Nucleic acid binder design. Sequence first.
RNA 1: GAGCUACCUAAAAACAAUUUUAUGAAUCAACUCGUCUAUGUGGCAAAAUAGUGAGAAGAUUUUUAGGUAGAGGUGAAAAGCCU
RNA 2: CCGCCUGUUUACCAAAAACAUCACCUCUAGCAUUACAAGUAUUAGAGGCACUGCCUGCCCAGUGAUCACUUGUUCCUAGGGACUAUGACGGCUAAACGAGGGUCCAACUGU
RNA 3: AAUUAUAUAACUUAUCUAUUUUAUAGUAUAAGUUUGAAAUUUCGGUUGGGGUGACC
Lengths: 216, 154, 325, 46
Amino acid sequence: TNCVKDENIKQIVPKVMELIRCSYRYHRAETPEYCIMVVGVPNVGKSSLINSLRRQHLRTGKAARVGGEPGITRAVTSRIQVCERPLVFLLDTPGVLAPRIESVETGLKLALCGTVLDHLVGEETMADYLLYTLNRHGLFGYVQHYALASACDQIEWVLKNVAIKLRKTRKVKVLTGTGNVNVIQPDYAMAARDFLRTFRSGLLGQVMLDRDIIPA
Amino acid sequence: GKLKRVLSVCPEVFTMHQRDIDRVVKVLREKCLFTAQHITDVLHRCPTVLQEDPNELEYKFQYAYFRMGLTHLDIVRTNFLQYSITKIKQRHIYLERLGRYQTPDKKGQTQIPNPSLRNILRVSEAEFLARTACSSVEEFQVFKKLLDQEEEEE
Amino acid sequence: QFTASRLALQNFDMTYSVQFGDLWPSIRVSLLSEQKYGALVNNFAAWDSVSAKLEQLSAKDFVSEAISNLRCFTFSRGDVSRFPPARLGSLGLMDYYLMDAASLLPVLALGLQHGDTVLDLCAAPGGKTLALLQTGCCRNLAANDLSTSRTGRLQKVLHSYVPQDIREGNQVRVTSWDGRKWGELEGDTYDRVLVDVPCTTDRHSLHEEENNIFQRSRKKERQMLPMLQVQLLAAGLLATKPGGHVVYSTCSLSHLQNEYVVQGAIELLANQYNIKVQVEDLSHFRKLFMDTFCFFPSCQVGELVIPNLMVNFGPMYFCKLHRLP
Amino acid sequence: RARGNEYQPSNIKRKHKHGWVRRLSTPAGVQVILRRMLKGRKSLSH
RNA sequence: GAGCUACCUAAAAACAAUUUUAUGAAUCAACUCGUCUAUGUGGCAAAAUAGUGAGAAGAUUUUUAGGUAGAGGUGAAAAGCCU
RNA sequence: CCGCCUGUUUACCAAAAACAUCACCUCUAGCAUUACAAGUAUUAGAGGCACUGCCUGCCCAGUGAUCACUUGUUCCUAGGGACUAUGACGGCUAAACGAGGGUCCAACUGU
RNA sequence: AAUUAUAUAACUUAUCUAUUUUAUAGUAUAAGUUUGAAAUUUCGGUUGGGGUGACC
Ligand SMILES: Nc1nc2c(ncn2[C@@H]2O[C@H](COP(=O)(O)OP(=O)(O)NP(=O)(O)O)[C@@H](O)[C@H]2O)c(=O)[nH]1
Ligand SMILES: [Mg+2]
Ligand SMILES: [Mg+2]
Ligand SMILES: [Mg+2]
Ligand SMILES: [Mg+2]
Ligand SMILES: [Mg+2]
Ligand SMILES: [Mg+2]
Ligand SMILES: [Mg+2]
Ligand SMILES: [Mg+2]
Ligand SMILES: [Mg+2]
Ligand SMILES: [Mg+2]
Ligand SMILES: [Mg+2]
Ligand SMILES: [Mg+2]
Ligand SMILES: [Mg+2]
Ligand SMILES: [Mg+2]
Ligand SMILES: [Mg+2]
Ligand SMILES: [Mg+2]
Ligand SMILES: [Mg+2]
Ligand SMILES: [Mg+2]
Ligand SMILES: [Mg+2]
C-alpha cells in the first residue's frame, strides 16, 4: 500500500474482516466493535496508515501525529476509529526494534530507510553504503540530479563535488605537525545528510536493497 | 412564478385568515428553525403545508429530524411534508423493523447503509416492496393492519 | 446504557441473522410485531358452548382441519383479529385459555395415550399443563418447577380450569424441586415426559425489560444455559421408562440451544449410562399443519415453528425422542 | 511589576471626583454630606 | 470607587543613523516589553537588581481631561481585569 | 513538529501549539433624527474557520424522448376528476516567519 | 433537576375609539395560552477509593 497516494489501501479492510471471521473470536465474539492493532519497526508509516484508512473510509482527517523522523509516537494510543460500516478501530503503537539485527549489513539497510536514528550510525558511513548499493545496482540517478560527472565510486570524490553544488562549507580543525589550525573545508556532513534525504524522497530513483536475495 | 403554483395548489390562501398562515410560518421559524430560504421553498414545493393545521406539521418535521436524523436540507429537497403521515410511519417503521433503516447514532454513524429517502416514499407500493423491502405485498398489508391496531391501543 | 432489549436484538443480528440469512428479515419484524393468540377450549360443560361461540367469531380450529383430544380455535390466515378476553363458565370454570398455537404442538406431538404416567418438568404456567390435562382423559400426571411464585400461579390456573374432583385425584401432583435432582428421585417412572427447559425467550426478551436473560448482571446464566439444558434433558431421559417417548421444547431460535443440545444429550446418555435413543421424524405432522404453521427444514433434528407475518405463531422448537431400551 | 503607587495626584481629577459641587449634584451625594455633618467631621469633602 | 487596570471618546506629543524600497520589511539606540540564568528572599524591591533577550513608522508608545460600576462594567477569552 | 505571518494574553509562578489575524463560509435584518448611523444588501449585526490551485460529498422523477404514459400529490365517490416542464468534506500549497517544542554537525570553551 | 417567571416577543376573549350592518380595525387595561432573558433552591444512605451493578 502506498500511503501518500492511498494505493490499494481499500483492499486491506476486506482482508482484515475476512481473516477475523474465519478465526474464533472466543471472548470477544459477542462484542460488535472490531479492534485491530498495527505494529512495526519505526518510520514505516504505521501512524500514517491509521490516518490514511481513517480519511479513506470515515473521511474525517488525521488521527495521529505523523512525522518525518522516527520516534514521533512515544507510547500506545487510544482506539482510533477507521471505518463506520464494520466499526473497525486501529490501535497505534510505537516502533520497536529487536536488540539483535543479525548482520551489520541489515543495519545499514535499516539505517538507509531511516528506521534507526542517523546520529548513532553516522551519515558519513551511511552515505558510502548508498554509493556502493546504487553503483552495484547501476541506477545512476544521482549524476543527473547532482551534476558532478558521468559516474564515480569514491565516497570522498562524490561528497566533495556535491558540497560545491550546494555551496556548503564549514570551518574544521585539522591536526597538523606544527599545531592545531582551523582551516575552512568543504562541508562533507551536509553532503551526506542532503544526499541521504534525496534517496528517501525518491529523487535518485526506486531501488531494491535486497535485490541479491531474490534468487535465494 | 412562485406564487402561481402556490395559488393554483391552494387558492384559499388569500381567503385564509392571517392567524392560520402566521401560525404555520411561525412554527417553522420558532419550532423547526428552518432557514429563511428554506421556508419560502417549502411553501412553493408543497403548498399543502398551509392547509395542514399547526401542531401536526411540527410532529411531522420532528419525525424526520429526530426519528430519522435527517437534516433540514434533506427535508426540503425531498419534499417530505407533502407525503401523508400514515404512509411515512408505515414504511419507515417497516424498514426499521426489517433492519434496512437505522436511526443515526449519537456519533452520527450508521453501521448498515440506509436506503435512499426518495425510494422509501416516492416509488409505488409495488415497486417499494419489490426493491426497498423485497417482501410480499400480502405480508405488508398485514403489517399495515397490525400497526393501525397498535396505534389505536397506544 | 443499553437496555436488555437492545442487547437481545444485537445478539440475534450478529448470530441469528447468519444462521437464517435471507429469512431473517421477515422473522425479525415478526418478533417485533404483536403476537397472535389462539384460544384453547376448556371442554367440560362449556365444551359445546365455546365451539359454537368461536364459530360465530369465524375462528377455525386448525386441529380440526389437520384431522380432516385437544381443539384450539384460531383466526384465519392473515387475520389480525383479537380474541375476546376469557370469561368464566356457568360451572365456574374459565371457558377458554388464550395461548400461542405453536405452544400446543409439543403436547400434540408427544403422542399422549390412555393409561400413562406423565411428568412435566419445569412446566410453569406455560399453558401446556392445562392443555395436557385436557388430553389426560386417563393419564396420571406430575408437575415440577424450580421457582415457587412461578409455580404458585400454576396452581391458580389449575383451580380455574381443572375441576376439583380431577385435581383431587393423585393424577394431578404439583411439586417444586430441581429438575436435575428429580432424575434420580423417580427413574423410569413416566412413559411420556415433556421437558420445557428455560430458554432465552426471544419474543419476551425483546418486548419485556423485566426478568430479561440479556441483562448484564445475568451474563453468567445466559452463557451456561446450554449446559443446564443438557442436564435437564438428561434428567428426563433417566426418568422416562423403557420404550418411553419424550419431547424437548425450546422457545429460542438459537442453533446452539436447539439441535446441539439434543444430540449432545443423546451422546452423553449413550456413553455414561449406556443407553440408546431412537430419532423420530415428524415431517408428516408438518405436512398436515402447513396451513396453520410454517417450518424451515434446515434443522437436522426438531421441528422449529418460524414466526411469519401471515402466521405469527412462533417461535417453538420441539423434538420428540423415544427411549429405545 | 511593583505595586503601591496607584495614587497619581491630579487636583482637577480630585476635585471633580470627590469635590463639593460633585457631592451636591446627586441626593445620594448630598446624603454623604449629611451624615458627615452629623458625625462632626473637620472636612465634609475635598 | 475606572488617578491602578480593561475598553472607548476628545485634544495632543515622540521616533536618531543605516539598507531596502515604498513596507503591521531589515540592522540597531531612545523608548516599549519581560524569553532565559543568576542573585535576592523581613530583600533596594509586598515582584527588584545584574546579565541576557523581543519589538522599535506601527494593530506603535506616551501625556492630559472625560465616559462605562458590582443582578454590573470591560475583555485580540487568561473565567483576565475593575486601587 | 506546531502555528500561515506582524500582532495579543493569565499585573505578582505558564508568552505557547493558546487568542487575534487577512481570505473564505454561515445566519439575521428592506430601514431614519442619541449606539449601529446622519448609514441602506458590493451595506450593518452575530458566529464560525489559515488562505491557495487540486482531488473531492451526497443532491441531480422514471421510461418513451422539446413531446406521451407510468408514478407522485390531492379531492369527489375502486371508479372518476384535479395537479405535477457537485457543497457538510479532505489532503494540503510552501515558501516565509518564531526569546515556540524536539533534535544533529561544526567551532568553542573551567561544563 | 424541582418550583416559578407582567425580560421579550407573540396571539385569544374582554375593556375601549373609530368606523360599516354585523364587520374588519387598533388598544395607557385585565384574565388566559404559548415560548424562556432570567431569579430561587437542592445535591439520601450502605457498599476497603473509581466507573457499572446494585442493595435500603
Ligand atoms: N513518500 C512516502 N512517505 C511515506 C509513505 N508512508 C509514510 N511516509 C512518511 O513516513 C512518515 C510516517 O511514519 P511515522 O508514522 O512517523 O512512523 P511510525 O512508525 O509511527 N514511528 P514513530 O514512533 O516515530 O511515530 C512521514 O514522514 C510520512 O510522510 C509513503 O508511502 N511514501
Ligand atoms: Mg495603597
Ligand atoms: Mg497612570
Ligand atoms: Mg483617566
Ligand atoms: Mg486589552
Ligand atoms: Mg527613524
Ligand atoms: Mg506586557
Ligand atoms: Mg531584533
Ligand atoms: Mg524580527
Ligand atoms: Mg519595524
Ligand atoms: Mg480558555
Ligand atoms: Mg483591590
Ligand atoms: Mg504564531
Ligand atoms: Mg509575534
Ligand atoms: Mg502568570
Ligand atoms: Mg508574546
Ligand atoms: Mg514568564
Ligand atoms: Mg516563541
Ligand atoms: Mg562536535
Ligand atoms: Mg441556602
